[PDB]
Amino acid sequence: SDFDNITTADDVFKLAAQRTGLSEIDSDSWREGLALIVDEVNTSPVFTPFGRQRVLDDATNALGRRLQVHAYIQDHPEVLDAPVERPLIVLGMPRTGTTVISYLLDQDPARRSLLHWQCVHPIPPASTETLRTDPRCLALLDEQRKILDAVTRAKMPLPHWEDADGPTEDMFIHNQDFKGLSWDSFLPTDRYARWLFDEADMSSTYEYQKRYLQVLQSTAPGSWSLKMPSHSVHIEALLKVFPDARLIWAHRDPYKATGSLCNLWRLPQSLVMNTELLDQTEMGRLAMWQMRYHVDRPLRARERIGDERFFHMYYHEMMRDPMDVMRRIYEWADEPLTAETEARMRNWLAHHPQDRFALNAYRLDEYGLTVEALQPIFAEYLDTFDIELEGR
Numbered sequence: 517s518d519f520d521n522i523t524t525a526d527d528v529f530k531l532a533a534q535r536t537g538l539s540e541i542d543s544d545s546w547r548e549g550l551a552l553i554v555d556e557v558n559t560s561p562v563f564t565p566f567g568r569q570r571v572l573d574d575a576t577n578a579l580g581r582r583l584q585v586h587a588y589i590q591d592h593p594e595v596l597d598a599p600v601e602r603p604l605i606v607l608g609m610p611r612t613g614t615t616v617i618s619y620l621l622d623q624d625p626a627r628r629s630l631l632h633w634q635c636v637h638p639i640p641p642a643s644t645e646t647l648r649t650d651p652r653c654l655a656l657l658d659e660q661r662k663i664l665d666a667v668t669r670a671k672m673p674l675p676h677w678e679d680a681d682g683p684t685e686d687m688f689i690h691n692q693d694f695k696g697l698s699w700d701s702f703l704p705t706d707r708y709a710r711w712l713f714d715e716a717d718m719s720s721t722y723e724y725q726k727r728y729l730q731v732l733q734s735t736a737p738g739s740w741s742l743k744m745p746s747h748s749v750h751i752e753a754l755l756k757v758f759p760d761a762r763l764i765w766a767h768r769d770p771y772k773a774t775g776s777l778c779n780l781w782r783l784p785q786s787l788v789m790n791t792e793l794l795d796q797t798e799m800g801r802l803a804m805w806q807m808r809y810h811v812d813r814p815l816r817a818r819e820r821i822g823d824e825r826f827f828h829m830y831y832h833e834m835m836r837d838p839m840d841v842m843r844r845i846y847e848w849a850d851e852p853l854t855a856e857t858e859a860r861m862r863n864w865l866a867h868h869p870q871d872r873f874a875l876n877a878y879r880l881d882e883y884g885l886t887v888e889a890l891q892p893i894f895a896e897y898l899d900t901f902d903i904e905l906e907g908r
């Protein structure tokens with residue numbers, strides 16, 4: 517299992533087949549994206565020798581999951597017959613501060629959420645009663661606690677999980693088809709991101725997500741609650757696969773979210789790249805380019821299908837009164853918010869105080885941006901949605 521002889525996407529495949537002990541796969545869709553990633557980790561000089569191995573190791577594990585899910589479905593065709601109806605899906609720009617709602621929806625026992633451990637070890641699926649106590653989940657929690665090296669180091673802002681097994685993004689299902697925006701944050705250039713947004717056919721990916729969800733439902737049934745910012749970008753393919761999707765559009769100051777995006781990228785850049793070869797001023801234009809797709813893709817879809825197909829969740833409303841937003845979400849989704857559930861939601865908020873709404877200078881200077889430069893990108897967006905800014 518070494519990345520010395522990994523030159524092509526097929527080599528990555530062999531390793532994944534080696535590790536998982538499986539060799540059959542559902543299609544060829546995974547190859548195009550993985551080939552772009554591999555070509556870059558091999559050729560780009562910005563990568564640390566370690567960084568290269570890290571990216572290839574993650575790709576291998578991701579592809580291995582794809583292999584594991586395919587073997588399972590073949591042995592359990594019936595899972596494909598059970599529908600995934602009216603999934604609750606949160607989309608929009610990244611850095612909108614949606615974390616709270618994901619956890620609150622997870623408090624409803626009739627609703628299912630995608631937990632991070634299910635994006636690491638999906639097969640075999642667990643029962644509802646054990647979604648948070650399954651040994652694979654516990655093991656993940658323990659080796660997470662088993663990396664708390666007090667070696668005078670802070671950490672690495674991403675202990676993905678929170679409490680015992682929490683909601684995660686569909687991004688970690690999607691990257692298994694190598695058509696997910698997360699891979700781009702591990703790449704020095706924007707070739708992969710431009711391919712993804714302007715060329716990649718996203719159908720294979722969303723079709724894969726549905727199968728994935730059908731496998732998790734088979735042992736732990738319920739109505740799905742999903743999230744992933746770039747669902748906004750790929751909203752057309754999403755609708756194709758989940759035509760009945762109840763879309764929750766998450767909003768927040770676009771200027772703030774943009775600078776926050778650029779900042780978010782620093783962590784993966786520092787984990788696998790020689791940061792001195794990077795230009796943070798150039799990261800600003802990429803973030804700007806990416807944000808444009810995050811607002812226009814869904815804006816066009818909304819113009820076509822109607823505002824009523826969406827629920828608008830504002831960051832400022834989520835801070836001042838989340839419980840109010842929940843009741844309105846439930847009314848809108850026309851579903852009863854039981855007292856038991858409302859209590860769990862309140863109990864969660866009590867134990868998880870949220871950062872008060874505050875206004876500070878965004879300052880995209882650090883990334884070569886200005887509100888004046890971003891204004892045209894979000895002009896329509898800010899004009900159609902009443903967003904409370906956190907500027908100056």
Ligand SMILES: CCCCCCCCCCCCCCCC(=O)O
Nearest residue numbers: 610685687697698700701744745746
């Ligand atoms: C817009 C993000 C949608 C997916 C949400 C799960 C995490 C994906 C990556 C988060 C950063 C999104 C912005 C682009 C980052 C990149 O270029 O990789």
